[model samples]
Target: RPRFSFSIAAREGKARTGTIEMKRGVIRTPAFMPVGTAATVKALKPETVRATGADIILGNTYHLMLRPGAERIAKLGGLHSFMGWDRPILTDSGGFQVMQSEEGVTFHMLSPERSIEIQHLLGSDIVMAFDEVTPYPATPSRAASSMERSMRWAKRSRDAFDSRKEQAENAALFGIQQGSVFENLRQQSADALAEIGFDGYAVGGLAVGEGQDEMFRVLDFSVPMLPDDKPHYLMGVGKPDDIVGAVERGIDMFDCVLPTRSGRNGQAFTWDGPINIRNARFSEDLKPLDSECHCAVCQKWSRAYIHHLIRAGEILGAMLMTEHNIAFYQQLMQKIRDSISEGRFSQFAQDFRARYFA
Candidate 1:
């Protein structure tokens, strides 16, 4: 399939739909990869996950490396075999987890050398280079230091990936661009990565408590600087509306915990916006979570039943909501893809924003 080439099967204005054919499998873009942080997608089974139309899933390098250890997984036949998922897996460089640790969460990056070594050992199909995501509101000097450190780490990550004889054939290493919100530093980071080259590129430092407006500003300038030929991934990106805006700006891949995490907390994402199932308004509502949705939960259960289950603190409530939320996200992706194919993406985006915000 030639590494990561996009076909642009359809386009409407800046929006588009395509397939990313890598050595692992074909990822349909603009795709939403469900985050399987602990090698599991919360309440759903791998088969159920596949049924939601997800071509790929995301794994967290920090969590896996800290716990089960990548070498153990490889000995157990890699992540796919360990998790019982035959599809593709994209893993972050464990940088964000390390950043969160610095913010007071208990975690660590096993040094730059060890970070890359572990990702390679885990048999990651698309591996992110380690980069410290500078905290938002950071001083310019702080941002620059983070970016420079990440660049050095990126080089080491690339070298480690190339040196691994077992990983050379099928896996790919991606360079992450990090510069906080400063454009010059971003350009410097991009230029450095371009010199080294990679199978893909990722916009790594936004979405870390930066508001949507600021995050969008970063993407507006940053995305165009990336190589158009390779896949452009937005790591740990956001809500439903956030995904829509990112696609319009030409991001091809996304991974987020919104849908699944919110589902477990009794929240439902709909075309209208996010709805709290535990709210009094839904207590006696006989309607489905979203009248327009065709997910398993919506098709069979009423909002009243779902609300009752949630109020009763039943585990099934979480499972059904999580499944429905995943399905809803997949449907949203398909809708965007269809709109792009038909060249109505501009109108689609406007309509989506209006409805979702209304």
Candidate 2:
């Protein structure tokens, strides 16, 4: 049974290159997966997304399960045939998006068993553990209690994934880390997860509100506590610099909605920081969206045209901007991969940040 496999190919300090092999496809390490909430990458088509060099994309269990229904997707040929994205799809446990209250509510509660079942129904290649989220500003006592529940949830998620004995094959299971900035709780969570075992691990509960310095501090301790051999997934992250910094700190994969969301509102992430197409300065500018980008939009359209479309609320504006931003991220990932392989990831990070985040 060819399920999921990972192996390191090169190393440069804490940054090393690797590969994630799934029956659906091979995803390179230090990879960035675009968010395809509800099984679509917003206005971009599957082809356009793949063309941006993405090996895998994410779908949300919370949203999909509510709208068309996860069972409906499974009946309709799962996510692959239904969405026409034959590449590996990673489905969130919908845990983070769900509320933690025990009170009955509408689609607000997601248990580990239910999450694993939904992932199986969606036919995701990689299924995440349904851990309770304790996003930011949590006191030590609150974090400790939250982390314990998350570990319990992790065990249940693993058990549920394994208990599904009737599926064609088990989707790769990745447990998540939850401590909300407490190192001791993080260590406890990591140790518990390691004991339970998983195909991979994730650093959850970050990018919520803790600033860059604090987030990095948490990673410094928490990321190193996980099993070194398994892939480390950083969930719900982040800006370009954040991705670069995370990869440098030994993170292997990331997913974020920043690119698509910002793109839709006329913001373009350029190599020299992000620029707004709706700005008056761009009203007469005939230059490309990003001078360094070779994407379809940059190759053919001018900033002026994109600005006009944005002003008039044209859908094409969102489409073109989204495609380019995703492409930019993919290119950045490739650069990180290459730099790590060449033992120059630090230099790459420094140079990139100086220019972009300036």
Candidate 3:
């Protein structure tokens, strides 16, 4: 078991399909890591998440620290054992909630060093560095200052992670690049992080209401700035189409709460797009949520039943929808991996966008 190692197996255009070997398990490239905030993927169980083809899941440091507490989890045998998730778990450093400062951060006790300590206590496989998220449409000076602080925090995060001899030996730490929408600032942040070094690098501060085109534009210049050998994570991103574009732009890892959150609200994702199950149109529709989706819910239930469940305010409605939505995401990633491996990701993306928007 390697602590962490990424190897590209195939490439088509800017897209690449690969595997990330870790002691806990292997994460396939262009992976969609469903958010498991507070040690759970909301309504679904760990086994159900695995059945959805998820190689890994994300944990939130902010939520865990506030509730069950990192020390509590550590005493209970860590996040993997406590959550009953044997696979890899990637935990954010709780930087997104509160702002940052030169000395530390403004949010509670979530300093760079403290964030690393919490992640260490959680026994995460991939620990994200604490970073200040630069807001969109910011002045160049504001973005620069934020990026500079994040770069400094990246160094502090690295030192704290490395100081934990036993935890550092098994866990991987990822540095975040934050520069809002400035190309030069992005390049500077990337260069600084590359100098400090990390197990992987994440393109942070996007998907913060920047819209798709602007986000894509930033990625155009930003993605190329990081080291290509390690995994490139796009933080807090996006709809299915957004993911398709990011993967095409060379990102390797992603995490978002959209699927699970939307499902709980009666929204279900499909190959064509997302659909609202609470719509009156689904009241009598006997078809599956998506004809192409082969998830257990899709294969076993009808839109009519789901619609009834939602209308009747049944708990099972959210559970079933969440399961299917997550499964749909994983299946989409599998298709992407297959397309990249077969050297047809370009055509696949084209066809996918056409139907997804149609």
TM-score of each: 0.94, 0.97, 0.98
lDDT of 3 by residue, 162-276 (tens): 9999878999999999988888999999999999999999999988887899999999999999998889999988789999999999999988899999998999998788899
Q: How big is the positional error of residue 354 in model 2, measured in Å on the Cα after superposition? A: 1.3
Error of 3 at 142 (Å): 0.8
Q: What shift in Å separates residue 304 of candidate 3 from its native position after superposition?
A: 0.5
How would you encode candidate 2's per-residue C-alpha lDDT over 152-181 as one tens digit per residue?
A: 888888888888874426469999999999
Q: In candidate 2, where is summed lDDT lowest over 10 consecutive residues? A: 100-109
Model 1: residues with Cα > 4 Å off, grouped in runs:
1-4, 100-109
Ranking of candidates on lDDT, top first: 3, 2, 1
Which candidate achieves the best TM-score against the true structure? Answer: 3
**What is the Cα-based TM-score of model 1?**
0.94
Residue 300's lDDT within candidate 3 is 91
Winner on lDDT (1 vs 3): 3
Off by over 4 Å in 3: none
